[PDB]
Amino acid sequence: TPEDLAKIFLDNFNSEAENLSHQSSLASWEYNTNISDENIQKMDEAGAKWSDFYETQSKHAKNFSLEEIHNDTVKLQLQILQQSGSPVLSEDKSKRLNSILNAMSTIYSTGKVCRPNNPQECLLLEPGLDNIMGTSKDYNERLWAWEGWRAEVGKQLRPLYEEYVVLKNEMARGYHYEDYGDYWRRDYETEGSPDLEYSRDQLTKDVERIFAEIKPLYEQLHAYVRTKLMDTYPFHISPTGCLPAHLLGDMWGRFWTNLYPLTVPFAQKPNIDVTDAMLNQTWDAKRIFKEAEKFFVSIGLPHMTEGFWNNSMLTDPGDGRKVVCHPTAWDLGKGDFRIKMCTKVTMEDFLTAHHEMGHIQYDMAYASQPYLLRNGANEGFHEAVGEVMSLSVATPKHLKTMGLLSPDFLEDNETEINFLFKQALTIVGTLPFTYMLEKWRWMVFKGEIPKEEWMTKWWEMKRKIVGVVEPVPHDETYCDPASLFHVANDYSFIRYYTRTIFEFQFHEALCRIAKHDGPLHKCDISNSTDAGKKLHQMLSVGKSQPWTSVLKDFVDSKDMDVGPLLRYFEPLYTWLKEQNRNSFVGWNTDWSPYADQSIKVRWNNNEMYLFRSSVAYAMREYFLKTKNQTILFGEEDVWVSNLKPRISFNFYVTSPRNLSDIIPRPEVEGAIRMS
Amino acid sequence: CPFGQVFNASKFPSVYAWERLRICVADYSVLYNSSSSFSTFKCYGVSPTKLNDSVYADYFVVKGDDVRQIAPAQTGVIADYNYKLPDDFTGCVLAWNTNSVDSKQGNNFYYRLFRHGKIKPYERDISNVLYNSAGGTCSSTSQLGCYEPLKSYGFTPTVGVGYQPYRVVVLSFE
Numbered sequence: 013t014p015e016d017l018a019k020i021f022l023d024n025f026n027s028e029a030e031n032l033s034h035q036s037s038l039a040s041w042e043y044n045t046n047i048s049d050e051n052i053q054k055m056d057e058a059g060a061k062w063s064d065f066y067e068t069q070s071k072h073a074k075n076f077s078l079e080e081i082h083n084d085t086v087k088l089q090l091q092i093l094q095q096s097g098s099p100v101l102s103e104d105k106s107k108r109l110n111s112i113l114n115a116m117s118t119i120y121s122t123g124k125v126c127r128p129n130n131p132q133e134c135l136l137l138e139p140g141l142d143n144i145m146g147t148s149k150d151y152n153e154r155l156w157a158w159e160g161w162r163a164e165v166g167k168q169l170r171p172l173y174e175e176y177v178v179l180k181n182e183m184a185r186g187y188h189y190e191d192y193g194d195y196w197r198r199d200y201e202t203e204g205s206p207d208l209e210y211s212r213d214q215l216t217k218d219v220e221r222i223f224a225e226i227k228p229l230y231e232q233l234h235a236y237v238r239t240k241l242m243d244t245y246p247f248h249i250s251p252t253g254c255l256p257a258h259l260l261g262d263m264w265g266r267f268w269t270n271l272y273p274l275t276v277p278f279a280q281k282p283n284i285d286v287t288d289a290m291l292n293q294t295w296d297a298k299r300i301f302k303e304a305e306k307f308f309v310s311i312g313l314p315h316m317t318e319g320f321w322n323n324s325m326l327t328d329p330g331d332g333r334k335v336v337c338h339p340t341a342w343d344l345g346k347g348d349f350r351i352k353m354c355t356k357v358t359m360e361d362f363l364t365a366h367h368e369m370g371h372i373q374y375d376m377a378y379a380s381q382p383y384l385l386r387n388g389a390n391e392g393f394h395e396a397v398g399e400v401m402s403l404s405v406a407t408p409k410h411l412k413t414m415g416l417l418s419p420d421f422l423e424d425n426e427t428e429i430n431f432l433f434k435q436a437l438t439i440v441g442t443l444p445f446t447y448m449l450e451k452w453r454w455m456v457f458k459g460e461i462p463k464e465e466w467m468t469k470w471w472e473m474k475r476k477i478v479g480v481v482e483p484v485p486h487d488e489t490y491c492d493p494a495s496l497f498h499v500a501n502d503y504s505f506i507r508y509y510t511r512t513i514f515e516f517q518f519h520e521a522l523c524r525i526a527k528h529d530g531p532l533h534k535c536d537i538s539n540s541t542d543a544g545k546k547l548h549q550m551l552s553v554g555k556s557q558p559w560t561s562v563l564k565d566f567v568d569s570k571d572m573d574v575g576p577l578l579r580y581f582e583p584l585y586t587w588l589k590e591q592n593r594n595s596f597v598g599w600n601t602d603w604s605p606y607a608d609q610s611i612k613v614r615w616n617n618n619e620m621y622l623f624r625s626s627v628a629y630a631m632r633e634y635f636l637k638t639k640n641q642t643i644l645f646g647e648e649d650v651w652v653s654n655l656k657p658r659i660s661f662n663f664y665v666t667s668p669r670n671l672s673d674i675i676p677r678p679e680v681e682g683a684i685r686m687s
Numbered sequence: 688c689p690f691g692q693v694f695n696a697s698k699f700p701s702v703y704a705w706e707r708l709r710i711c712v713a714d715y716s717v718l719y720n721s722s723s724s725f726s727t728f729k730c731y732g733v734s735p736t737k738l739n740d741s742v743y744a745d746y747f748v749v750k751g752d753d754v755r756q757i758a759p760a761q762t763g764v765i766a767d768y769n770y771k772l773p774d775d776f777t778g779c780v781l782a783w784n785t786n787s788v789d790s791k792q793g794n795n796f797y798y799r800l801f802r803h804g805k806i807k808p809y810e811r812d813i814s815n816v817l818y819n820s821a822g823g824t825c826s827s828t829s830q831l832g833c834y835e836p837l838k839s840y841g842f843t844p845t846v847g848v849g850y851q852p853y854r855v856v857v858l859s860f861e
């Protein structure tokens with residue numbers, strides 16, 4: 013009886029939801045294709061109706077006992093509804109939390125950094141600072157952009173993030189989770205046989221295990237980059253120490269892609285770029301997607317439907333309306349699949365087309381599932397399936413048969429590494445960042461790190477795990493892990509770790525079924541229907557089965573495994589190893605760019621304020637009396653390092669408002685001794 | 688007999704409330720001379736080369752995927768609650784895709800999802816009361832267990848071929 017009642021409830025939910033979520037998603041599409049004041053309010057209206065329905069149904073779902081249900085595809089759907097859609101908060105705390113998140117998003121998105129010679133000139137992150145960090149070679153300009161962002165947006169998000177953490181934990185406990193960090197990783201939890209079970213608190217053990225196995229390769233990549241980078245930024249990088257945070261070619265140091273032009277193995281060897289071939293042969297934006305389709309079809313996957321070809325915005329329409337040029341695949345529901353892109357005839361957007369069609373093939377594969385189960389087995393599978401496809405079509409062998417790469421083109425083992433190195437900077441160089449960012453957040457939500465220790469632990473563990481050091485010291489008025497998109501906007505970041513690991517497990521499995529004989533980095537699953545159909549079986553399951561069993565039937569294992577990643581980059585590893593023979597590999601967490609010239613001193617924030625003011629005072633008089641110079645040093649010009657409360661700290665002083673110009677140790681020491 | 692008022696009709700009814708007209712000269716120029724028009728065409732107990740040598744027509748709008756339920760000895764939401772044919776059925780079922788006509792802004796078609804028991808062959812239930820999942824009747828859909836038995840088809844101009852309206856005509860030869 014109670015199981016049948018649960019089934020009736022779900023039948024009602026699924027049949028009612030299917031033609032309601034459709035309207036909300038359709039309205040969203042129209043808005044992003046045609047941006048207007050009328051379309052935005054219609055988008056919200058449609059969304060509101062769907063949200064209200066979901067909340068009511070989620071609350072109803074709570075009064076069905078899971079122990080009374082003997083069906084797995086029923087119990088699972090009830091669990092999904094019971095643990096979402098309805099927070100347990102006072103109305104005042106529901107108005108508030110939604111007023112901090114909106115505030116943080118806005119502060120990030122409208123944040124700008126001004127110039128210390130000119131105030132009416134301010135650069136924004138998206139059209140501005142981002143194109144400086146990824147191009148400039150000027151140590152001083154890179155420092156300005158790096159520090160300015162964190163000292164402008166970072167200082168605004170600190171008090172908001174503190175309230176955010178407290179309220180989110182209370183919310184998470186309303187679902188019977190220990191904290192919000194625990195809530196986030198519930199997606200990896202599975203129920204079933206003792207052999208196929210997985211606990212949410214197991215993830216924090218497994219990602220650490222994989223990292224330890226990765227590190228030995230990262231250290232070789234790190235050492236190589238350091239010795240090559242040292243020739244671009246001399247006197248700023250130590251042969252035994254950490255890399256400066258602002259010299260990684262990025263605002264956050266998420267990827268090392270932009271260091272390639274500085275750290276390229278074989279500068280005399282060109283990379284493959286068929287942008288010119290595509291233009292010469294008269295390719296358009298449509299042909300790119302037709303070729304992407306052909307690839308998937310050759311391995312036994314379904315053709316793209318007519319609705320896709322007629323409704324998708326594959327190319328920017330020209331004019332008359334503003335569109336959002338941010339590539340993404342859409343599932344509108346009810347057999348309506350689309351891709352939204354502003355496609356250009358380039359190589360980089362060729363690989364992208366393959367990647368976004370990887371999504372749409374997956375979305376089709378599990379379309380037959382119950383509404384609530386129409387998702388990936390795991391959050392990391394959806395991007396593993398998409399990305400594994402871009403590896404097989406980046407191979408010269410594919411371009412040669414396509415006719416994009418010149419006939420009789422010669423390749424060798426000098427250029428395979430030139431290539432793998434570029435990939436390592438994206439795939440390996442990002443893993444320790446993702447790892448420690450999420451690890452820090454978990455500790456913050458859990459309550460292991462007191463508010464007063466947020467910034468001290470952030471940089472402490474970052475130097476230990478990643479091997480990157482700040483150019484200037486930061487106190488607790490800053491919030492570095494808030495000036496990044498995913499942290500400010502409440503997104504989980506672990507999905508960018510596990511998908512990298514799964515991606516290569518899938519890659520190797522596919523290249524094995526396809527009977528590849530040779531290096532793993534030069535495989536191609538095109539024309540291989542035996543590998544394609546095996547993949548399809550793994551996709552069609554959706555979320556109806558636990559990811560552990562879904563993976564096992566495809567990769568013949570259970571836990572995530574980095575083995576395949578280390579093997580993929582094995583060549584490179586054995587090459588870097590023979591290059592780093594005269595250099596030091598690894599780093600020591602006791603060197604800093606500002607530690608060479610500072611004064612050691614041997615008590616709350618109000619006492620430190622007075623101290624810094626006093627130092628600025630001594631400086632003003634020293635310079636005026638000794639060199640007859642009038643320089644107005646302020647409290648903000650005295651930086652404090654290595655604070656060990658009550659007992660000791662280090663400090664140094666810079667010229668007024670000038671970050672790069674540090675007063676020579678013997679000169680500031682003079683000012684202190686003088687007064 | 689006015690086959691043109693069934694096959695060339697400006698509007699069809701919902702599947703939950705199907706209409707039936709009684710059938711003169713038994714012409715077949717609209718059934719077996721143009722078969723490229725129909726997407727589905729199956730006969731039971733009779734062949735296209737035999738029919739030529741009372742026939743009542745039941746017609747309604749149903750989504751593509753549910754067209755397969757319009758047959759003898761079938762089960763499913765439509766077969767069990769909206770439109771049922773007997774196992775011992777003689778006649779033909781014809782259907783065609785009318786996405787360009789029925790999938791508009793104000794065109795709402797309904798089917799029955801919940802009922803206290805299955806319907807008999809050729810039974811037409813057009814009532815509309817709240818369904819109590821625990822048995823009997825109830826009021827207010829806010830109460831757990833109360834559901835509306837009639838739900839719409841989310842037909843729109845751009846949706847999959849399996850969620851596109853089809854016009855079905857069933858010719859039962861008695």
Ligand SMILES: *[C@@H]1O[C@H](CO)[C@@H](O)[C@H](O)[C@H]1NC(C)=O
Pocket residue numbers: 046047048049050051332333
């Ligand atoms: C975009 O939306 C506005 C507001 O309704 C409308 O006037 C305009 O015609 C739309 N653009 C297109 C191409 O439909």
Ligand SMILES: *[C@@H]1O[C@H](CO)[C@@H](O)[C@H](O)[C@H]1NC(C)=O
Pocket residue numbers: 075831
């Ligand atoms: C759960 O269903 C039972 C049985 O009708 C009823 O006693 C109880 O009030 C319901 N609980 C909730 C939360 O609606």
Ligand SMILES: *[C@@H]1O[C@H](CO)[C@@H](O)[C@H](O)[C@H]1NC(C)=O
Pocket residue numbers: 082083084085086
């Ligand atoms: C669960 O219900 C589905 C139908 O909704 C059925 O096909 C499946 O066999 C059932 N499984 C079990 C264990 O009852």
Ligand SMILES: *[C@@H]1O[C@H](CO)[C@@H](O)[C@H](O)[C@H]1NC(C)=O
Pocket residue numbers: 292293294
């Ligand atoms: C492509 O480039 C070659 C250069 O040798 C040129 O001869 C050829 O005409 C170009 N193709 C087209 C379509 O112009």
Ligand SMILES: *[C@@H]1O[C@H](CO)[C@@H](O)[C@H](O)[C@H]1NC(C)=O
Pocket residue numbers: 318321322
């Ligand atoms: C796109 O829509 C037009 C409407 O004029 C139609 O004729 C064309 O065949 C459609 N495209 C496809 C692939 O059906």
Ligand SMILES: *[C@@H]1O[C@H](CO)[C@@H](O)[C@H](O)[C@H]1NC(C)=O
Pocket residue numbers: 310409410413414536538539
């Ligand atoms: C796949 O096979 C076809 C022949 O059916 C061939 O033309 C095409 O180049 C092959 N693709 C690859 C990547 O080898």
Ligand SMILES: *[C@@H]1O[C@H](CO)[C@@H](O)[C@H](O)[C@H]1NC(C)=O
Pocket residue numbers: 425426
């Ligand atoms: C590339 O292979 C040749 C053998 O064909 C070898 O002698 C050469 O040293 C290799 N290049 C590198 C960087 O190992």
Ligand SMILES: *[C@@H]1O[C@H](CO)[C@@H](O)[C@H](O)[C@H]1NC(C)=O
Pocket residue numbers: 691694695717721
């Ligand atoms: C509708 O009438 C026209 C004109 O007689 C005929 O050609 C067409 O086949 C009819 N439609 C159907 C479904 O019979």
Ligand SMILES: *[C@@H]1O[C@H](CO)[C@@H](O)[C@H](O)[C@H]1NC(C)=O
Pocket residue numbers: 715716719720739
């Ligand atoms: C139309 O039906 C008649 C009678 O069955 C048949 O003789 C004729 O060949 C059919 N026309 C076509 C084009 O098949």
Ligand SMILES: [Zn+2]
Pocket residue numbers: 395398399
């Ligand atoms: Zn992706």
